[PDB]
Symmetry: C2
Subunit: 47 residues, 2 copies
Amino acid sequence: MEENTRQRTENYISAKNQHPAWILLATRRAPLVLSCLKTLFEKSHDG
Amino acid sequence: MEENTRQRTENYISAKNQHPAWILLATRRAPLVLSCLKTLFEKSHDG
């Protein structure tokens, strides 16, 4: 059986749009923004 | 101290090169190759 593949590749191609995190890691400015968000959120859960 | 940031951002900007996986996730063809490698390696550890 290989039907799962034709669903698996579709799942992955879809997820590499729409779902943010994968879009975020792929856009040039990702390192900067990850650093900034992490350093900020590291010291406050309540906004 | 904010100095840790000036090392943290450098760590991240570095890792966004050299280290493959973050390079792999970022190049368009990533979904296809991820699917292929996963489906292949899923059924064999010895090559």
